[PDB]
Amino acid sequence: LHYPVTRQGEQVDHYFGQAVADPYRWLEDDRSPETEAWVKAQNAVTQDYLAQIPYRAAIKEKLAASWNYAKEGAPFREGRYHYFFKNDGLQNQNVLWRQQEGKPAEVFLDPNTLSPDGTTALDQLSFSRDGRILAYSLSLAGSDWREIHLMDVESKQPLETPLKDVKFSGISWLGNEGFFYSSYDKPDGSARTDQHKVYFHRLGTAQEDDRLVFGAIPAQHHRYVGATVTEDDRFLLISAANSTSGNRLYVKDLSQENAPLLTVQGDLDADVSLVDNKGSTLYLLTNRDAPNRRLVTVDAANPGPAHWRDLIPERQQVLTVHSGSGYLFAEYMVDATARVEQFDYEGKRVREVALPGLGSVSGFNGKHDDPALYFGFENYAQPPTLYRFEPKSGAISLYRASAAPFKPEDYVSEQRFYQSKDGTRVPLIISYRKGLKLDGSNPTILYGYGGFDVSLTPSFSVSVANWLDLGGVYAVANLRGGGEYGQAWHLAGTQQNKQNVFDDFIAAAEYLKAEGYTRTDRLAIRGGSNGGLLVGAVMTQRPDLMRVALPAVGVLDMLRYHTFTAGTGWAYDYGTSADSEAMFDYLKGYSPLHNVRPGVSYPSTMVTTADHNDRVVPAHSFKFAATLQADNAGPHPQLIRIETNPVAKLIEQSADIYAFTLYEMGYRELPR
Numbered sequence: 001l002h003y004p005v006t007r008q009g010e011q012v013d014h015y016f017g018q019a020v021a022d023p024y025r026w027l028e029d030d031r032s033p034e035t036e037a038w039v040k041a042q043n044a045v046t047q048d049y050l051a052q053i054p055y056r057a058a059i060k061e062k063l064a065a066s067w068n069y070a071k072e073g074a075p076f077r078e079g080r081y082h083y084f085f086k087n088d089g090l091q092n093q094n095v096l097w098r099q100q101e102g103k104p105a106e107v108f109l110d111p112n113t114l115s116p117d118g119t120t121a122l123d124q125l126s127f128s129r130d131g132r133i134l135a136y137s138l139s140l141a142g143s144d145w146r147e148i149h150l151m152d153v154e155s156k157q158p159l160e161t162p163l164k165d166v167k168f169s170g171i172s173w174l175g176n177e178g179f180f181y182s183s184y185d186k187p188d189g190s191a192r193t194d195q196h197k198v199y200f201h202r203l204g205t206a207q208e209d210d211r212l213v214f215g216a217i218p219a220q221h222h223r224y225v226g227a228t229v230t231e232d233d234r235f236l237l238i239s240a241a242n243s244t245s246g247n248r249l250y251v252k253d254l255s256q257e258n259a260p261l262l263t264v265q266g267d268l269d270a271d272v273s274l275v276d277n278k279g280s281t282l283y284l285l286t287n288r289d290a291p292n293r294r295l296v297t298v299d300a301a302n303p304g305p306a307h308w309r310d311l312i313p314e315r316q317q318v319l320t321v322h323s324g325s326g327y328l329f330a331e332y333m334v335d336a337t338a339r340v341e342q343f344d345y346e347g348k349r350v351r352e353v354a355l356p357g358l359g360s361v362s363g364f365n366g367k368h369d370d371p372a373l374y375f376g377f378e379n380y381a382q383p384p385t386l387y388r389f390e391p392k393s394g395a396i397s398l399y400r401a402s403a404a405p406f407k408p409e410d411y412v413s414e415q416r417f418y419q420s421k422d423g424t425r426v427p428l429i430i431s432y433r434k435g436l437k438l439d440g441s442n443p444t445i446l447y448g449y450g451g452f453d454v455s456l457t458p459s460f461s462v463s464v465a466n467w468l469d470l471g472g473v474y475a476v477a478n479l480r481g482g483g484e485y486g487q488a489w490h491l492a493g494t495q496q497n498k499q500n501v502f503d504d505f506i507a508a509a510e511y512l513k514a515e516g517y518t519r520t521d522r523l524a525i526r527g528g529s530n531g532g533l534l535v536g537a538v539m540t541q542r543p544d545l546m547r548v549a550l551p552a553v554g555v556l557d558m559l560r561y562h563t564f565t566a567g568t569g570w571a572y573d574y575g576t577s578a579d580s581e582a583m584f585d586y587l588k589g590y591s592p593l594h595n596v597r598p599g600v601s602y603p604s605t606m607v608t609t610a611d612h613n614d615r616v617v618p619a620h621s622f623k624f625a626a627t628l629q630a631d632n633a634g635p636h637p638q639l640i641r642i643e644t645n646p647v648a649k650l651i652e653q654s655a656d657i658y659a660f661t662l663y664e665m666g667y668r669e670l671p672r
Contacts, residue, residue: 074374079131324366381411450479524548536592558591601634
């Protein structure tokens with residue numbers, strides 16, 4: 001193995017009197033001729049090394065053969081038809097299908113044929129109350145602008161000319177008269193502003209005559225406004241905001257002539273949104289005086305915050321509310337997995353929905369008179385599945401099995417909890433092919449993130465599935481720093497407590513060995529971005545803990561990350577070398593780049609990154625890889641794979657990592 005030559009410069013940096021050498025400073029410029037040449041050479045070496053792997057092409061083919069597959073969404077009633085989305089598995093955009101009691105399903109709206117390239121995409125979709133008219137917004141390329149088209153459902157032809165200059169808008173019908181939408185500019189003609197306004201479009205009229213509903217007078221100026229009409233057409237709810245944090249909310253009783261807007265919340269101190277109404281009672285989801293949120297009710301005739309009353313009190317877990325079939329469904333995240341509770345509109349707990357196991361859910365959204373509801377379920381061992389739920393009995397039946405070439409019963413996903421160094425308990429979800437033997441010899445990949453209040457919830461991955469099909473184990477740890485247990489869990493993994501994140505990950509690794517799942521020479525750690533940091537730190541503190549290290553797009557230079565493009569936004573979680581001498585010593589103490597040491601024997605490593613990236617600059621990966629090649633004294637290869645310029649590329653990347661990981665664990669033949 002012959003690593004390219006990496007020039008060492010004389011750049012020296014100073015932090016509170018302390019000097020730190022940065023020999024690869026020049027590699028921070030990913031667009032200099034010298035760096036691109038370095039990239040080119042590193043890739044040649046990496047590829048040459050991977051071409052030495054016998055089963056690489058086999059793993060690739062297997063992945064490509066299982067990567068794409070058909071999908072289907074839950075069906076919804078609109079007028080005299082049931083609608084549902086479908087996807088060939090190849091089609092860029094989902095197609096909307098329609099079905100009528102008698103005949104068989106038929107294609108209704110295919111967004112793919114609206115763009116020669118398949119760019120023009122479907123955004124919002126809203127049917128009129130009777131289901132006879134369809135309003136839908138389409139977005140071109142990566143634009144924010146929209147047009148709202150009106151289609152006659154029965155004929156499938158354009159009802160009227162489409163509405164233009166629509167942006168950050170919903171579409172909410174008022175019976176069969178027309179609908180509310182948002183826009184920054186008068187339907188007439190004028191010069192731009194950042195004053196978002198709500199307009200009502202009455203069918204059979206020109207857009208230029210749409211009436212102003214909210215947002216024009218100075219007292220109503222806001223950057224973002226939304227409008228929603230309740231299912232029973234009784235109330236109009238208008239939200240107004242200037243940012244993603246907090247919003248004002250107003251209500252208008254449409255059952256009364258020229259009713260004025262009443263204020264549900266007149267300040268931006270908190271988030272409040274409409275769930276539904278029952279009679280004159282409003283059901284609102286809000287985080288006002290409740291970080292984990294609560295569901296409250298208040299009469300529409302006097303809706304101010306002082307009159308709100310808890311229907312579903314704030315709990316230790318963050319609440320999400322869905323409504324359907326005359327029921328309210330409280331969704332939570334417990335130990336990173338879903339839990340759903342059913343309630344009636346009077347706050348009486350009906351039952352705890354019995355989900356198909358531990359995982360992630362979607363659905364439980366429907367109309368008042370839907371006889372049944374649908375929900376999606378999935379996790380590391382089970383591909384997205386559609387289930388039917390009987391509101392009254394609570395009976396759950398399989399509606400649509402996944403078309404993914406992976407039979408769920410052949411896989412196991414068990415939940416475990418271990419203890420960190422200080423004694424903290426941490427969740428760990430291990431998945432694998434059924435029939436595993438706890439002999440501690442299974443090629444294992446341990447994944448983690450740990451930070452930015454990001455919570456790692458289970459989700460199906462074709463790549464992971466293929467890993468399991470190779471006899472491998474996939475373990476995901478919910479390290480501190482994430483958002484699996486509120487704020488206290490997040491802070492325990494930030495600033496001068498970041499080391500807690502690494503310890504937790506370290507503890508997870510030892511657990512997998514102790515419990516006989518794998519062993520050092522059969523273990524690999526993986527992570528991306530803040531996750532790459534995780535891998536980089538752990539591999540520099542405990543290079544004896546694993547056999548393989550797979551850091552992707554990681555933040556590795558902890559002393560200069562903040563000076564790079566987009567690095568500013570991660571200061572809250574990490575702190576900076578400039579903050580104070582104390583912060584500097586901590587950052588320098590674990591910074592991957594600065595903790596690689598000459599003479600040490602590091603695990604087999606494959607650093608991955610794109611050649612250019614604004615979120616996490618390649619500089620981190622380039623300098624880290626260069627340092628590992630120069631310092632490592634063992635037999636393990638320190639490689640970096642740089643993606644240049646797509647499912648093809650994704651498939652190729654997964655193959656290289658798995659092929660490499662297995663090849664580095666000694667396998668000279670696929671496991672088994």
